[PDB]
Amino acid sequence: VRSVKVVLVGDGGCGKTSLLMVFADGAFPESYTPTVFERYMVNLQVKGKPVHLHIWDTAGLDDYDRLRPLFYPDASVLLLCFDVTSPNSFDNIFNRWYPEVNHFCKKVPIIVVGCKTDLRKDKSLVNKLRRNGLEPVTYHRGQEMARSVGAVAYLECSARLHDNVHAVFQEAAEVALSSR
Amino acid sequence: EYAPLTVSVIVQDEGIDAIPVKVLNCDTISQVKEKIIDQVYRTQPCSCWPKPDSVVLEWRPGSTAQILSDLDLTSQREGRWKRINTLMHYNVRDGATLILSKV
Ligand SMILES: Nc1nc2c(ncn2[C@@H]2O[C@H](COP(=O)(O)OP(=O)(O)NP(=O)(O)O)[C@@H](O)[C@H]2O)c(=O)[nH]1
Ligand SMILES: [Mg+2]
Ligand SMILES: [Mg+2]
């Protein structure tokens, strides 16, 4: 009976809650609702062994920055999320979320995650970005960020399409347990 | 206007010679009494008297609650002193939901 505390952080609307709901309840939310804080408990297997997962869903808005550090203590792994379509959320991975994590959680492993991957293959959206001289984030750019931040791994997923979702948390529990 | 006012109070049962009590001349006789009780009896053994630190206050905007404290990991140390956390420190909006429970 091994338990692991998982905490997700990332800019508001980058898709933290949708990632968890699809993983836990198997349901995707169409309407955006800013999360305050929630705890999802999930039983999973790791290399043939059951591992309970305490998972916390934080608020990415700037208005809850003073409440968020309450969930950092006793963390086993930190998922730093960003929106692939929003270059701003990719910057705040290093400008905003890394200093906040490095301040409190000096030793907790970091796993950078790129969300809303399904939006990369949307012509109507990428052209709106390309007309403004901006391209969606690519794999080698998400990797260099995880490297610059000092993350252990770097994964991508799409909550809208269930792809690579269950794999994100399997890697989270493996890093958390092997680093214990 | 008003005025600060230090007063000398004697309590019959406790037998202390005198107790300085800082009050205001605009304080009513009821406010002055409680100002004295909070100085002589808040530290007296009373199992049925809930004090803020014998009491937990949790906040849940969703399905899970979290404990709010006067000073925790989120407290910003402003000046000579650690600023005690407020309701707008935790950004507790109107219509929130709280839980009170003994330790
Ligand atoms: N197309 C697409 N939309 C997504 C995906 N994940 C989330 N979204 C959308 O993006 C918006 C934000 O989702 P949400 O999970 O609530 O983001 P959040 O990080 O939890 N916001 P906050 O941090 O303020 O609580 C919603 O409108 C949701 O439908 C995805 O994989 N694909
Ligand atoms: Mg949310
Ligand atoms: Mg704002």
Author numbering:
A (entry chain A): 15 to 194
B (entry chain C): 1463 to 1565
What does the paper behind this entry write?
Plexins are semaphorin receptors that play essential roles in mammalian neuronal axon guidance and in many other important mammalian biological processes. Plexin consists of a large multi-domain extracellular module including the ligand-binding Sema domain, a single-pass transmembrane helix, and an intracellular module that includes a GTPase-activating protein (GAP) domain and a Rho-family GTPase-binding domain (RBD). Plexin signaling depends on a semaphorin-induced dimerization mechanism and is modulated by small GTPases of the Rho family, of which RND1 serves as a plexin activator yet its close homolog RhoD an inhibitor. RhoD binds plexin RBD with similar affinity as RND1, but it strongly inhibits plexin signaling rather than activates it.
To experimentally determine the binding mode between plexin and RhoD, a negative plexin regulator, we screened various combinations of RhoD and the intracellular region of plexin family members from different species for crystallization, which resulted in crystals of the complex of mouse plexin B2 and human RhoD bound to the GTP analogue GMP-PNP. Analyses of the diffraction data suggested that plexin B2 degraded during the incubation in crystallization drops, and the crystals only contained the complex between RhoD and the RBD of plexin B2. We solved the structure to 3.1 Å resolution by molecular replacement. This domain-swapped dimer is likely a crystallization artifact because it cannot form in the context of a plexin dimer, in which the two RBD domains are far apart from one another. We therefore consider each RBD domain formed by the two halves of the two molecules as a representative of one intact, unswapped RBD as its conformation is very similar to the structures of other RBDs. The structure confirms that RhoD binds the plexin B2 RBD in a mode similar to those of other complexes between Rho-family GTPases and plexin. The GTP analogue GMP-PNP and Mg2+ together stabilize the ligand-binding switch I and switch II regions in the active conformation, which make an extensive interface with one side of the beta-sheet of the RBD. Interestingly, a superimposition of the RhoD/plexin B2-RBD complex with the RND1/plexin B1-RBD complex based on the RBD domains shows that the orientation of RhoD and RND1 relative to the RBD domains is slightly different.
